Amino acid sequence: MDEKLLKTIAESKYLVALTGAGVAAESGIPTFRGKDGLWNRYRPEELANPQAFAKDPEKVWKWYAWRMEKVFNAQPNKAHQAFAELERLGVLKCLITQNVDDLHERAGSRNVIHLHGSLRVVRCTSCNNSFEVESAPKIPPLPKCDKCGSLLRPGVVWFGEMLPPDVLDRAMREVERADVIIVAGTSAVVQPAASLPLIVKQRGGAIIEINPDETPLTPIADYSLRGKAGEVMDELVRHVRKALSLKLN
Numbered sequence: 454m455d456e457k458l459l460k461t462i463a464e465s466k467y468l469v470a471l472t473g474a475g476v477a478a479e480s481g482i483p484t485f486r487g488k489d490g491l492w493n494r495y496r497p498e499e500l501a502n503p504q505a506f507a508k509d510p511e512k513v514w515k516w517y518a519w520r521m522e523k524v525f526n527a528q529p530n531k532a533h534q535a536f537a538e539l540e541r542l543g544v545l546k547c548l549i550t551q552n553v554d555d556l557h558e559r560a561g562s563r564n565v566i567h568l569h570g571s572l573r574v575v576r577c578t579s580c581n582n583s584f585e586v587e588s589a590p591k592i593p594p595l596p597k598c599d600k601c602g603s604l605l606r607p608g609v610v611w612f613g614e615m616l617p618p619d620v621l622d623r624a625m626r627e628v629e630r631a632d633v634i635i636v637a638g639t640s641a642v643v644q645p646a647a648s649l650p651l652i653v654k655q656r657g658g659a660i661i662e663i664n665p666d667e668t669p670l671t672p673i674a675d676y677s678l679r680g681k682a683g684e685v686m687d688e689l690v691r692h693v694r695k696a697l698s699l700k701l702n
C-alpha cells in the first residue's frame with residue numbers, strides 16, 4: 454500500500470484483472486484448493502470431468518445443483534464491489550475470471566470474461582441449445598433438452614475440456630495490451646489461465662498479486678499483497694479514487 458503501488462494503478466493506461474475462487478471466499482463460498490477447499494473433500498475426478506459425467510450424470514448434476522443454489526443465494530463481497538468500482542472509475546478495463554459464479558456481475562462489473570464458463574448457463578450435450586437459469590434445478594430427474602431430448606449439462610469447463618477459443622482469444626488480447634494486471638484469489642496452477650499474467654510481464658507490464666498465500670506467480674509479481682481480496686481491494690480502490698479526485702482538471 455505504498456505510494457509506488459498506488460501510482461502504478463492510478464497512472465495505468467490499460468489495467469486488467471484476473472480473479473480466481475479466492476475472490477468469492479468472503480461471500481461464504483469455499484475455494485477449490487487449500488484448507489477447506491472443495492477438491493480436498495470432493496474428488497475433481499468424479500465431479501469435474503466429462504468421463505465422470507457420462508458415468509454418473511445424476512451424481513454430477515446433484516453436486517452442481519447444490520453449488521448453484523449456494524452461489525445464487527450468496528451476495529457479492531467487498532472485493533467484488535471494489536472491482537466494479539475500479540471499472541466505474543475508468544481504471545479497470547476488463548475483468549477476466551476463472552470463477553463460474555456471477556458475483557462480479559451482481560456487483561456491477563460490466564466487461565467480464567468467464568474463462569471457465571458459468572453456473573448460470575446450462576447447455577445440451579448433443580445440440581447447440583443453451584440458456585441461463587434463475588435458480589437451481591432439482592435432481593432427479595436429469596435435466597433434459599427441450600430441443601432434442603438429450604442430457605443437459607452445466608455450462609462450465611471441466612478438466613481435459615477445451616476453453617472456448619473465442620473466450621480465451623479475447624482474454625489473450627486483453628492481457629496483450631495491459632500495462633498492469635491485478636491477479637487476485639487464484640492459486641496460479643491451472644492452465645491456461647495461469648499463463649495470462651506472464652504475458653503482461655513478458656510484454657513489459659506489471660503484476661499485482663493479491664492472495665493470503667504465496668503462489669508460483671509470486672516470484673515475478675511486482676507487488677504481492679498477503680491479505681484477503683475484500684480488505685485489500687477495498688482499501689486499494691478507495692485510495693485510487695482519492696488520488697484521482699485530487700487531480701487538477
Ligand SMILES: Nc1ncnc2c1ncn2[C@@H]1O[C@H](COP(=O)(O)OP(=O)(O)OC[C@H]2O[C@H](O)[C@H](O)[C@@H]2O)[C@@H](O)[C@H]1O
Nearest residue numbers: 473474475478484485486551638639640643664666681682
Ligand atoms: N479471502 C481471500 N482473498 C483472496 N484470495 C483468497 C482468499 N481466500 C483464499 N484465497 C486464495 O485463493 C486461491 C484459490 O485457489 P483455487 O482454489 O485453486 O482457485 P482457482 O485458482 O480460481 O482455481 C482455478 C480453477 O481450478 C479449479 O478446478 C476451477 O476450474 C478453477 O477455476 C488460493 O490461492 C487462496 O489462497
Ligand SMILES: [Zn+2]
Nearest residue numbers: 577580598601
Ligand atoms: Zn439438445
